[PDB]
Design a protein around this ligand. Sequence first.
Ligand SMILES: O=C(O)[C@H]1NCC[C@@H]1O
Ligand SMILES: O=C(O)[C@H]1NCC[C@@H]1O
Lengths: 348, 348
Amino acid sequence: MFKKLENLEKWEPPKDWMVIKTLDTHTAGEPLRIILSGFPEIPGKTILEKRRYLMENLDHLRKALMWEPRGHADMYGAIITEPVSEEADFGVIFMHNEGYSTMCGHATIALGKVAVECGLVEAKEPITEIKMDSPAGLIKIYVKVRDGKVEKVYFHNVPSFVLFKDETINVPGIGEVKYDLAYGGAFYAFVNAEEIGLKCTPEYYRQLIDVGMKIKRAIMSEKEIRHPFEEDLSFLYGTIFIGEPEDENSHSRHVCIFADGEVDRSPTGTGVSARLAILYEKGEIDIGEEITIESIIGTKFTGKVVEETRYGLYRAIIPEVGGNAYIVAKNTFLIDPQDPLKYGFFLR
Amino acid sequence: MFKKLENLEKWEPPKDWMVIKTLDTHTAGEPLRIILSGFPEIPGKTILEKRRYLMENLDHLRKALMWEPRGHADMYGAIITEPVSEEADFGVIFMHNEGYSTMCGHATIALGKVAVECGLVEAKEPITEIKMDSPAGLIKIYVKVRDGKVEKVYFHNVPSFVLFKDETINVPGIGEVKYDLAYGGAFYAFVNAEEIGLKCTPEYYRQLIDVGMKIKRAIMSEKEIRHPFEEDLSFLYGTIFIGEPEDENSHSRHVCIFADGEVDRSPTGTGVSARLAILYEKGEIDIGEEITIESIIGTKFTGKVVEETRYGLYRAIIPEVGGNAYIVAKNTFLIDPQDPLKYGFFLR
Ligand SMILES: O=C(O)[C@H]1NCC[C@@H]1O
Ligand SMILES: O=C(O)[C@H]1NCC[C@@H]1O
């Protein structure tokens, strides 16, 4: 019987079943579902064109993988494509509970870890470089390797800058909220949790979603959020609550509310990128000064300003974010043609 | 490159990595993670003894599979064991966000579907019978089979009975709540959603968790919930909100809040079982009268009173619950010995 049961592991579905193979990771608790097979080729000369193809043709499959029952409200995914730039190893479109997504730091860390750990690139010591065409632009991944093992994954992000500083907005049913709006490969409104009467802790999970989504919708309806070069990137990704650090060597804590009330269990890599831009512009950190930022579950990333730059009319930085990721599953997702919930459903 | 990527499918972890192989289903949207391998043998002469062995020795693995990152707050699992009774095919202990669990109807339907679909038992027409030792006692599974295909999965539950009728309890911050308390292989307090100012709809997800868990904790602190024969079964499993039916042929809608604020996406099989006992005792349904009950996502089970019986000092019924399940994945879960979140974490 126990053999029959184990042998179910070699059960093969009918030939009219859709099969999608994935490698799942967590980065600081935040999942990445890496699609290995079962998607068609994604035409487009740019990553943003590829992202448009996916949004217009393959959003059913995004739901099938990100939504219950195969996923959940807080699941996050990656489609790997051929590079579109001269120097990049691969291209990527991310996905979440609401759609196909722009750049994401926790996912970049996971992709760097698996590239070296699983032997897709040679494990060079002390540093392996991988280049990735993201929807936001070119990302440089630096994997720290010792004795053929990954010690840490860093990336250097696209230019990160402050859009708005020390704004106030009237949030219906909440009141006056003070925010900075910064770009770290995505746009975020940063607010102080304690000033709003919240903590960046599990016991405030529901209130962080509710208040974060109201702040997000209020800023989206009142402010133009313009990427200097790309209409498709010109939108608010989320609200990030800044909280006091739990641990002595931590700078601060992040809770990112993004997509459709999705919550990042990581400190958010694009979030740390945008935060470094704010702290740098305010003269609160210097070039080469490493800080540590926590998540709602006390997981951590490092952040550091690498250098100064310009991006359109903005003063900008190249930020470094550091972390690590672990493989948690190899999944074969199956879609029964008779399944009435084949493309999943959404509760949160 | 795309071959390298696909070949990640056949990446094999180091020998010191834990590997747990599963078959994932949904029943009316509610997941079941069926463990195929990776657990030791579970000693015990009774299912409740086996449940105690798992709770005392293997709760780390329950978290590893039910909790993020490999699971989520609403994930549900099954451990298959050798039968302990003369006539049963197998034994089972269920698991959820809080621990190793007693009997569960959505999971029973999934196990019946898989047993026939995946050829663990002969597909007999029109009915295949499978017997299952649950922690609540012997369960009879009746799979309707036509042309070698499963049309529907029914089970006949353990004797189901009313414990308390038309009680009221003061719930702090909510007020006076009217409830019935019934057993359907688990104990539930039934409350009317609309009378409390809620709807059994996705829009009320958060409020259903909050109010359901306050009702649950209040009833657990105030009322003796005694299974006539087994101390380990003597506790309140959850709160079930009764709502008006969305669809013409539906009787009513269920939302079950159970374990640690977990929400059943199905109508709850033990819930329908306990509800049939209430409606029968109130003279609202007769033997052989089939009703349909909806879930928060509008998925459905059938319920029917099969016959009358006694259980200890109670008037009881044998309830029939009907539904269907679909395979959604074959999973190989991996635990990296260096993963600091190897046994997962809990947010809701
Ligand atoms: O780390 C990040 O940047 C992403 N994590 C999930 C949401 C963010 O895009
Ligand atoms: O259908 C059932 O009985 C189970 N579904 C999840 C919670 C219940 O135990």
